[PDB]
Paper text:
The nuclear exosome targeting (NEXT) complex plays a central role in directing non-functional transcripts to exosome-mediated degradation, but the structural and molecular mechanisms remain enigmatic. Here, we elucidated the architecture of the human NEXT complex, showing that it exists as a dimer of MTR4-ZCCHC8-RBM7 heterotrimers. Dimerization preconfigures the major MTR4-binding region of ZCCHC8 and arranges the two MTR4 helicases opposite to each other, with each protomer able to function on many types of RNAs. In terms of architecture, we found that the biological unit of NEXT consists of two copies of each MTR4 and RBM7, assembling symmetrically around a highly intertwined ZCCHC8 homodimer, with an arrangement conducive for targeting different RNA substrates.
The 7 Å resolution cryo-EM map of the NEXTL sample also revealed additional density features near and/or within the expected RNA-binding site of the DExH-box domain. To better resolve this portion of the complex, we focused the cryo-EM processing solely on the MTR4 DExH-box domain, allowing us to obtain a reconstruction with a local resolution of 3.4 Å. Briefly, the ZCCHC8 CTD binds along the bottom of the DExH-box domain, starting from RecA1 and ending at RecA2, in the proximity of AMPPNP. The MTR4 helicase channel is known to bind RNA in a defined polarity, with the 5′ and 3′ ends near the top and bottom surfaces, respectively, of the DExH-box domain (Gerlach et al., 2018; Weick et al., 2018; Weir et al., 2010). In the inactive state of the complex, the 3′ end of an RNA substrate is enclosed in the MTR4 helicase channel by a ZCCHC8 C-terminal gatekeeping domain.
Author numbering:
A (entry chain A): 659 to 698
B (entry chain B): 96 to 354, 372 to 606, 831 to 1042
The structure:
Amino acid sequence: PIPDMSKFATGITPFEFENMAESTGMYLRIRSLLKNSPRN
Amino acid sequence: MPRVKVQSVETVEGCTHEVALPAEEDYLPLKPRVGKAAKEYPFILDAFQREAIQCVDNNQSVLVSAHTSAGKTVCAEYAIALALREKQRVIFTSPIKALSNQKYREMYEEFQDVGLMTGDVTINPTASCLVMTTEILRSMLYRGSEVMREVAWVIFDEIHYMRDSERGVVWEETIILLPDNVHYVFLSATIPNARQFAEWICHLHKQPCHVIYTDYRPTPLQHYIFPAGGDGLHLVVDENGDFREDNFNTAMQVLRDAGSNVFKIVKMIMERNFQPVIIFSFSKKDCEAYALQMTKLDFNTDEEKKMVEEVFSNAIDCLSDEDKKLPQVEHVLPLLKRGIGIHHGGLLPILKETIEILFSEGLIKALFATETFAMGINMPARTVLFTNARKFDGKDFRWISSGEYIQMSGRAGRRGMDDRGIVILMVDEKMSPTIGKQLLKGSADPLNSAFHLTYNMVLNLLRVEEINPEYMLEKSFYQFQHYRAIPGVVEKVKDIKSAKRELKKARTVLQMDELKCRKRVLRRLGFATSSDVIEMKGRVACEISSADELLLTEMMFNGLFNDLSAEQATALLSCFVFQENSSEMPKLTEQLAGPLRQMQECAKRIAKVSAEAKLEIDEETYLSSFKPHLMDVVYTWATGATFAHICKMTDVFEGSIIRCMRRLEELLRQMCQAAKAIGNTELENKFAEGITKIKRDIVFAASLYL
RNA sequence: UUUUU
């Protein structure tokens, strides 16, 4: 039923990794200070 | 007619196990695992946990339908671990974008080989565990996108989102377009027709699909009702489930014969050690109003205020100096100091997730949130308090259903921290106790397929050489549910005979006349030929999937987007991503109303042809759908203005403006490589310039979970 | 009087 992706690729541009980003580490910086929280 | 069957394999005093087998197939029992566990756990799994793990271990699709507080994520973690061990790729899809960010955070913390892929952000897109949104997966499936070539599992989270008349169609598109050699894990809330979904999966991609259904919750709930006028809570239902009609009658008699209110109840709750608390309201003004009304009470300790200072300081240090002086930051800081906070869709998206982090930590002890804090978002509380019961849905003004009540009330009760959860309900105006008994006793809802036809569907399926719109119409869940009432359309043999004959015999063209009309419009305009093959004009429209692509492509080809500037083009494009209404109509200059009037003329020309071809469209809502309420805001923003300078020109919440700008950046991205289809180079880079002068200070900021 | 890519 479902054909191969080769025929899906034709007639349209491919899929690109627009707006690539990397972990700034801010979340780890905040978690580093979370030492005596009520939950932990 | 579909040929499936259910076997209902026995389960030992736990959940209910059933498997949908395709027609003539013998039920071979699940073989025990041979090897080592793919993922050990620090605790002891429950019955449905073990059953789902066993279903995954045998490379067979499984559906689990339970509560959110039951531990339904463990199965997906096991599937991801086992696919990692066997050197296979995984896909984890979520409906909401923020949910995707939180899921990526919590799964990078555990597996260490993951990748995020949404419209806005793409992190390490070479991994065996990709976290994506549903629309990115559908775009990949429609294009070549050779990333599912080596994938073995696909995990759908919150499968019940396929109940939206607006966005539940891409879900079915994604499910139908997937290959026949992949296995799925569907996660559900409690639904009546769990079996029918497994039957649909079995009929769809020739394989068994198990069903796990349980109603177990680790922490029992206790519901109360507070009549309008009185002191004290009336325990309607308890940890055993009986309705206790005497207290419902007592409360309703109080509300009848007798007929700061929230302040007193919150003080009562916080006096008898019932923290934390979630107060659910269905208007964003009421949340802020209640927070101001509680401003005169303090719950945090001296050290807790230092902690909230330390955690807020970095989050706003990421925000540059100019934005730290915004009114909202200084408005919210004292409230977070005292121990209270608000959560609604009008806040800045950075303050929202700051408050989410603070509530998860435990420093927020009374939150005032809207409906979409419980649906998703991974933090429970001890008490849930409803302030009203009526809500505006979008088309009328309506009471909360039992499904919504269960969803919001299930957030009360934390495993191991507290013995029981406390739920409080407020009734204020002639409850007329036919309803209120339904809310606290009924099941949640069945899930039904909407699956309306769209122009993008037809345009994409006419481009592919081996699939047609008729196939996707036939294989939809709508058709599957509409073939199921053969036992009861034929069984009317005992006037009503004419009626029952008509009804059953009639339907053969279900959503086929609409498809014919859409095709007729398409070949009338010029997107497809008479022989029904896509053209150059219709391949441009295939690259646009955020706004109305027909009218946008009509602009592209008529010559409306050239001889315009970049600022007044990206201001014109704002009419296609803003759909909320405002009290007042701003006044536009000639250089900002000419393009609007040409937009409206093109819309009228589109609608005339669309309505002379038997399609039921009224040419008042089509032109009223494009709302130029933010065109001057967008124009000012793409000139070098400040965010503070610009959120004073309209009575629209800042969060709404930020959402509109993010959607417009996405639409500009798609218009870039929709203009780079017809060899347009003067126009292609104008959209890129407009993209460059949007994302400058605060609308586009790094996520706290990312 | 909410909502969402």
